[PDB]
Amino acid sequence: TVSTPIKQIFPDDAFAETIKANLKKKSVTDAVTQNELNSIDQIIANNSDIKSVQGIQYLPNVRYLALGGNKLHDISALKELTNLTYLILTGNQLQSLPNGVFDKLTNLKELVLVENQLQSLPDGVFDKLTNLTYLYLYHNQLQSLPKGVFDKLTNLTRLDLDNNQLQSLPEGVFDKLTQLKQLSLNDNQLKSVPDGVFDRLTSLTHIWLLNNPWDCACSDILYLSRWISQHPGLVFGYLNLDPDSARCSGTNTPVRAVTEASTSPSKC
């Protein structure tokens, strides 16, 4: 039975110190076994200067991993942690995600990728995550989304895309999300949304639409204008309801108050 110092298994000094604390050991030099590592079901290591989680491959049973406010660039080492069910990576430095990095993480229920510097999502990056409930992607730099990116997420109840740089949404992007309760699209660069884009959202209770440059002169605005008018009890500002918070670029008047007469197909 091999007995190896925590520091040799986890070469990042900060992550070694996390593991020593987790196992209530007195020193990062202390020799540990695979059996002890199998006993770890959670890691909570916020704001801990962690640059690499190399070594975490040897924690097969970890189901809850909270790594906010570190310095991570790479999450390769998480790929075969098949019991992972909450993964919180807020405030790291992941700038791109490998295709399929989440493929084996089939028990994920909450995935938090906030404040990373994501500029694109791979096609199908979430396809294997059929049990996902909360997907948080806010405060990134996404300019567009792949077609069908959310399609396998049938149990999704919250999808936060706020504070990105989204220029448009793909048609039908939300069609498969019939259990979706919350959707945030505020603080983006949306001018319009596609005809019909919210129509399958039968279980929606909150949507946020503020701080987008909505193009109220163009006639593609009419779906959104009519949809807000028909669903004002779902449209939230920061705090509470606010169906007027979706504002027309320039004039700053409410999108929901646009008339067919004031628009024109020639402005698109």
Side-chain angles (χ1 to χ4, degrees), residues 133-145:
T133 293
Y134 288 3
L135 176 55
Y136 293 168
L137 288 173
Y138 63 87
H139 263 106
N140 278 106
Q141 284 175 25
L142 299 173
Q143 299 258 196
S144 69
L145 299 174

PDB file of all heavy atoms in Angstrom, residues 133-145:
ATOM      1  N   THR A 133     -29.555  21.482 -14.274  1.00  0.00           N
ATOM      2  CA  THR A 133     -30.701  22.282 -13.831  1.00  0.00           C
ATOM      3  C   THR A 133     -30.374  23.789 -13.906  1.00  0.00           C
ATOM      4  O   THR A 133     -31.113  24.554 -14.498  1.00  0.00           O
ATOM      5  CB  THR A 133     -31.098  21.803 -12.447  1.00  0.00           C
ATOM      6  OG1 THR A 133     -31.593  20.466 -12.635  1.00  0.00           O
ATOM      7  CG2 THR A 133     -32.264  22.546 -11.918  1.00  0.00           C
ATOM      8  N   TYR A 134     -29.202  24.166 -13.398  1.00  0.00           N
ATOM      9  CA  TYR A 134     -28.757  25.571 -13.391  1.00  0.00           C
ATOM     10  C   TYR A 134     -27.536  25.709 -14.265  1.00  0.00           C
ATOM     11  O   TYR A 134     -26.476  25.054 -14.022  1.00  0.00           O
ATOM     12  CB  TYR A 134     -28.339  25.963 -11.988  1.00  0.00           C
ATOM     13  CG  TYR A 134     -29.452  26.142 -10.934  1.00  0.00           C
ATOM     14  CD1 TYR A 134     -30.831  25.889 -11.201  1.00  0.00           C
ATOM     15  CD2 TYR A 134     -29.124  26.707  -9.685  1.00  0.00           C
ATOM     16  CE1 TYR A 134     -31.792  26.082 -10.215  1.00  0.00           C
ATOM     17  CE2 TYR A 134     -30.095  26.913  -8.677  1.00  0.00           C
ATOM     18  CZ  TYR A 134     -31.449  26.623  -8.964  1.00  0.00           C
ATOM     19  OH  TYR A 134     -32.401  26.853  -7.988  1.00  0.00           O
ATOM     20  N   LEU A 135     -27.648  26.512 -15.306  1.00  0.00           N
ATOM     21  CA  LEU A 135     -26.446  26.811 -16.139  1.00  0.00           C
ATOM     22  C   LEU A 135     -26.122  28.334 -16.148  1.00  0.00           C
ATOM     23  O   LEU A 135     -26.895  29.183 -16.640  1.00  0.00           O
ATOM     24  CB  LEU A 135     -26.679  26.319 -17.535  1.00  0.00           C
ATOM     25  CG  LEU A 135     -25.595  26.627 -18.569  1.00  0.00           C
ATOM     26  CD1 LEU A 135     -24.191  26.122 -18.143  1.00  0.00           C
ATOM     27  CD2 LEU A 135     -25.946  25.919 -19.914  1.00  0.00           C
ATOM     28  N   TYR A 136     -25.038  28.710 -15.491  1.00  0.00           N
ATOM     29  CA  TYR A 136     -24.748  30.161 -15.298  1.00  0.00           C
ATOM     30  C   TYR A 136     -23.550  30.547 -16.140  1.00  0.00           C
ATOM     31  O   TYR A 136     -22.444  30.055 -15.893  1.00  0.00           O
ATOM     32  CB  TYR A 136     -24.434  30.469 -13.846  1.00  0.00           C
ATOM     33  CG  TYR A 136     -25.593  30.307 -12.896  1.00  0.00           C
ATOM     34  CD1 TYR A 136     -25.362  30.313 -11.508  1.00  0.00           C
ATOM     35  CD2 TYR A 136     -26.925  30.239 -13.362  1.00  0.00           C
ATOM     36  CE1 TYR A 136     -26.435  30.171 -10.595  1.00  0.00           C
ATOM     37  CE2 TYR A 136     -27.971  30.076 -12.465  1.00  0.00           C
ATOM     38  CZ  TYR A 136     -27.723  30.063 -11.081  1.00  0.00           C
ATOM     39  OH  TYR A 136     -28.791  29.947 -10.193  1.00  0.00           O
ATOM     40  N   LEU A 137     -23.732  31.512 -17.034  1.00  0.00           N
ATOM     41  CA  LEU A 137     -22.729  31.861 -18.059  1.00  0.00           C
ATOM     42  C   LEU A 137     -22.522  33.324 -18.127  1.00  0.00           C
ATOM     43  O   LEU A 137     -21.861  33.859 -19.022  1.00  0.00           O
ATOM     44  CB  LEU A 137     -23.183  31.342 -19.457  1.00  0.00           C
ATOM     45  CG  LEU A 137     -23.099  29.832 -19.645  1.00  0.00           C
ATOM     46  CD1 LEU A 137     -23.736  29.431 -20.990  1.00  0.00           C
ATOM     47  CD2 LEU A 137     -21.686  29.288 -19.661  1.00  0.00           C
ATOM     48  N   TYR A 138     -23.086  34.014 -17.160  1.00  0.00           N
ATOM     49  CA  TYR A 138     -23.003  35.467 -17.144  1.00  0.00           C
ATOM     50  C   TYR A 138     -21.650  36.076 -16.866  1.00  0.00           C
ATOM     51  O   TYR A 138     -20.723  35.438 -16.307  1.00  0.00           O
ATOM     52  CB  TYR A 138     -24.065  36.072 -16.178  1.00  0.00           C
ATOM     53  CG  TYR A 138     -23.937  35.721 -14.723  1.00  0.00           C
ATOM     54  CD1 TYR A 138     -23.115  36.504 -13.867  1.00  0.00           C
ATOM     55  CD2 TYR A 138     -24.641  34.619 -14.175  1.00  0.00           C
ATOM     56  CE1 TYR A 138     -23.050  36.229 -12.499  1.00  0.00           C
ATOM     57  CE2 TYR A 138     -24.556  34.309 -12.790  1.00  0.00           C
ATOM     58  CZ  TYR A 138     -23.743  35.150 -11.981  1.00  0.00           C
ATOM     59  OH  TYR A 138     -23.611  34.915 -10.648  1.00  0.00           O
ATOM     60  N   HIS A 139     -21.503  37.328 -17.276  1.00  0.00           N
ATOM     61  CA  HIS A 139     -20.236  38.029 -17.166  1.00  0.00           C
ATOM     62  C   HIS A 139     -19.131  37.284 -17.889  1.00  0.00           C
ATOM     63  O   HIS A 139     -18.068  36.963 -17.311  1.00  0.00           O
ATOM     64  CB  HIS A 139     -19.839  38.349 -15.711  1.00  0.00           C
ATOM     65  CG  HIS A 139     -20.209  39.737 -15.300  1.00  0.00           C
ATOM     66  ND1 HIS A 139     -21.265  40.013 -14.445  1.00  0.00           N
ATOM     67  CD2 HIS A 139     -19.717  40.933 -15.687  1.00  0.00           C
ATOM     68  CE1 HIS A 139     -21.377  41.322 -14.289  1.00  0.00           C
ATOM     69  NE2 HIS A 139     -20.458  41.903 -15.044  1.00  0.00           N
ATOM     70  N   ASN A 140     -19.353  37.063 -19.179  1.00  0.00           N
ATOM     71  CA  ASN A 140     -18.330  36.545 -20.046  1.00  0.00           C
ATOM     72  C   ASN A 140     -18.330  37.441 -21.271  1.00  0.00           C
ATOM     73  O   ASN A 140     -18.836  38.562 -21.218  1.00  0.00           O
ATOM     74  CB  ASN A 140     -18.585  35.059 -20.404  1.00  0.00           C
ATOM     75  CG  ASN A 140     -18.109  34.084 -19.313  1.00  0.00           C
ATOM     76  OD1 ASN A 140     -18.917  33.475 -18.530  1.00  0.00           O
ATOM     77  ND2 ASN A 140     -16.815  33.933 -19.236  1.00  0.00           N
ATOM     78  N   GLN A 141     -17.743  36.978 -22.361  1.00  0.00           N
ATOM     79  CA  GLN A 141     -17.556  37.813 -23.559  1.00  0.00           C
ATOM     80  C   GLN A 141     -18.130  37.154 -24.810  1.00  0.00           C
ATOM     81  O   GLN A 141     -17.624  37.345 -25.949  1.00  0.00           O
ATOM     82  CB  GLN A 141     -16.051  38.076 -23.724  1.00  0.00           C
ATOM     83  CG  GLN A 141     -15.541  39.097 -22.745  1.00  0.00           C
ATOM     84  CD  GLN A 141     -14.004  39.259 -22.847  1.00  0.00           C
ATOM     85  OE1 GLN A 141     -13.400  38.979 -23.892  1.00  0.00           O
ATOM     86  NE2 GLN A 141     -13.376  39.693 -21.754  1.00  0.00           N
ATOM     87  N   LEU A 142     -19.195  36.390 -24.619  1.00  0.00           N
ATOM     88  CA  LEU A 142     -19.745  35.609 -25.702  1.00  0.00           C
ATOM     89  C   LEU A 142     -20.415  36.554 -26.720  1.00  0.00           C
ATOM     90  O   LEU A 142     -21.194  37.441 -26.317  1.00  0.00           O
ATOM     91  CB  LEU A 142     -20.778  34.644 -25.118  1.00  0.00           C
ATOM     92  CG  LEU A 142     -20.315  33.601 -24.089  1.00  0.00           C
ATOM     93  CD1 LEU A 142     -21.541  32.960 -23.604  1.00  0.00           C
ATOM     94  CD2 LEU A 142     -19.369  32.569 -24.751  1.00  0.00           C
ATOM     95  N   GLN A 143     -20.146  36.345 -28.031  1.00  0.00           N
ATOM     96  CA  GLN A 143     -20.702  37.199 -29.057  1.00  0.00           C
ATOM     97  C   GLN A 143     -21.834  36.539 -29.733  1.00  0.00           C
ATOM     98  O   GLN A 143     -22.670  37.226 -30.285  1.00  0.00           O
ATOM     99  CB  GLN A 143     -19.630  37.570 -30.121  1.00  0.00           C
ATOM    100  CG  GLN A 143     -18.477  38.337 -29.499  1.00  0.00           C
ATOM    101  CD  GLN A 143     -18.560  39.849 -29.765  1.00  0.00           C
ATOM    102  OE1 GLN A 143     -17.578  40.575 -29.586  1.00  0.00           O
ATOM    103  NE2 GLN A 143     -19.733  40.330 -30.187  1.00  0.00           N
ATOM    104  N   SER A 144     -21.834  35.210 -29.759  1.00  0.00           N
ATOM    105  CA  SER A 144     -22.917  34.454 -30.348  1.00  0.00           C
ATOM    106  C   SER A 144     -23.059  33.128 -29.632  1.00  0.00           C
ATOM    107  O   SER A 144     -22.252  32.739 -28.765  1.00  0.00           O
ATOM    108  CB  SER A 144     -22.690  34.261 -31.873  1.00  0.00           C
ATOM    109  OG  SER A 144     -21.602  33.385 -32.074  1.00  0.00           O
ATOM    110  N   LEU A 145     -24.090  32.395 -29.979  1.00  0.00           N
ATOM    111  CA  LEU A 145     -24.268  31.064 -29.439  1.00  0.00           C
ATOM    112  C   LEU A 145     -24.433  30.035 -30.596  1.00  0.00           C
ATOM    113  O   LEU A 145     -25.085  30.351 -31.629  1.00  0.00           O
ATOM    114  CB  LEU A 145     -25.524  31.064 -28.554  1.00  0.00           C
ATOM    115  CG  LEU A 145     -25.574  31.984 -27.328  1.00  0.00           C
ATOM    116  CD1 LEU A 145     -26.977  31.838 -26.779  1.00  0.00           C
ATOM    117  CD2 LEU A 145     -24.541  31.451 -26.347  1.00  0.00           C
TER     118      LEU A 145
END
